Short mmCIF file of C-alpha atoms in Angstrom, two decimals:
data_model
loop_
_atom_site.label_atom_id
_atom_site.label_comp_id
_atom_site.label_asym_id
_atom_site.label_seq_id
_atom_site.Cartn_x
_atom_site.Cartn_y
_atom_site.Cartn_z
CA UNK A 1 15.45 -25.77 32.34
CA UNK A 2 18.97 -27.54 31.84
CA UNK A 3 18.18 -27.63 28.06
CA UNK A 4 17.43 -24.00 28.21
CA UNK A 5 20.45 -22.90 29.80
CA UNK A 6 22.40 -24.98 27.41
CA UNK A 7 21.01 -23.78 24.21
CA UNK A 8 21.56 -19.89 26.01
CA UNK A 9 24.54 -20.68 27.25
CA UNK A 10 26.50 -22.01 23.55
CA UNK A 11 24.32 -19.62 21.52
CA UNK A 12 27.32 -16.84 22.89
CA UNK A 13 30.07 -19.45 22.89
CA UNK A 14 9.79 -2.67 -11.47
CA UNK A 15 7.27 -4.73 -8.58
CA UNK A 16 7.71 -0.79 -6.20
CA UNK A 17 7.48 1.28 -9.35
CA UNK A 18 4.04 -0.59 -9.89
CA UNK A 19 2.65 -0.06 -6.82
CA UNK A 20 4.52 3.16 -6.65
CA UNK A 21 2.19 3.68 -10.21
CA UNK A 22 -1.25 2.19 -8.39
CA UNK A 23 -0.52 4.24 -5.68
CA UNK A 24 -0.24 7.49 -7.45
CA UNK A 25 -3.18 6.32 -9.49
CA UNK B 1 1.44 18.39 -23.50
CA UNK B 2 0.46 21.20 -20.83
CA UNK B 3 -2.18 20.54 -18.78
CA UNK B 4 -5.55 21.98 -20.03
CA UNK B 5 -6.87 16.81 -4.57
CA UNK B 6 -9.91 14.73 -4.18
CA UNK B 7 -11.69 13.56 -0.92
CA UNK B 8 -12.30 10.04 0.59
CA UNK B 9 -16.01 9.38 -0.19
CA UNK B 10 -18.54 6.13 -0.37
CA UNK B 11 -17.46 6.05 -3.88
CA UNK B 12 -13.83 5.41 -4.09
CA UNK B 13 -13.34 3.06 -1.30
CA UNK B 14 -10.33 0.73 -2.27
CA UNK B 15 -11.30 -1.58 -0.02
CA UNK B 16 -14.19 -2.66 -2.21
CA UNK B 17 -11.73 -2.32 -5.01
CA UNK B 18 -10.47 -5.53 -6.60
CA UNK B 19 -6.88 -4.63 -7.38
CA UNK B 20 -6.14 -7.59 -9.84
CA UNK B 21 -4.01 -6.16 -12.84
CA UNK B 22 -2.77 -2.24 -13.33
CA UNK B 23 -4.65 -0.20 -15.38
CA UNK B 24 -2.91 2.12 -17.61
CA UNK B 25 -3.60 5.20 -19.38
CA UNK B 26 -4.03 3.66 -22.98
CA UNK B 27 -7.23 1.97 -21.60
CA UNK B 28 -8.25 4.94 -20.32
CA UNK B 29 -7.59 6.86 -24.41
CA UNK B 30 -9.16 3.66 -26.09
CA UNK B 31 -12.43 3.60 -24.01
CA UNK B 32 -12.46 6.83 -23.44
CA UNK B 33 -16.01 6.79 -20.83
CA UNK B 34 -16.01 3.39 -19.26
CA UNK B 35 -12.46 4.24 -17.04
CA UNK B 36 -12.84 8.02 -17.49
CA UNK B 37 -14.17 10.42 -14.62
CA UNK B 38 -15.27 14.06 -16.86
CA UNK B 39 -14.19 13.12 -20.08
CA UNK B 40 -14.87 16.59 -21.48
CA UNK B 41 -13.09 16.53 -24.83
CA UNK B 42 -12.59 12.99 -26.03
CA UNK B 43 -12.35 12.28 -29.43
CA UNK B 44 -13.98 8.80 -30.49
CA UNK B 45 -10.74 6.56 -32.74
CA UNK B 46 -11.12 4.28 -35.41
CA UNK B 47 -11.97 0.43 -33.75
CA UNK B 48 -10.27 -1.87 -36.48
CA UNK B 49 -10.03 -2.49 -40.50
#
């Protein structure tokens, strides 16, 4: 719980146009 | 050129489609009845000299 409060506390211290084309296929 | 809306059935399930590579529309013109739903007014090409 100590190392949990520590690491809390210091953490704030072309491919679409072909499916795009099988798609409207 | 000018041109001369379809349900989900049985038939056209993708899921028991294999989507592998794209097909395009010049497989469609150069088998013109394997790929082809109503091909009304294909015309059959030349295959190779």
């Amino acid at each position: 719980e100590r190392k949990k409060r520590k690491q809390f506390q210091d953490l704030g211290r072309d491919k679409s146009k072909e499916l795009h084309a099988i798609k409207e296929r | 050129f000018e041109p001369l809306d379809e349900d989900w059935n049985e038939f056209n399930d993708i899921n028991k489609i294999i989507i592998r590579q794209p097909i395009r529309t010049e497989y469609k013109i150069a088998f013109p009845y394997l790929y082809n739903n109503l091909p009304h007014h294909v015309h059959l090409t030349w295959y190779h000299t």
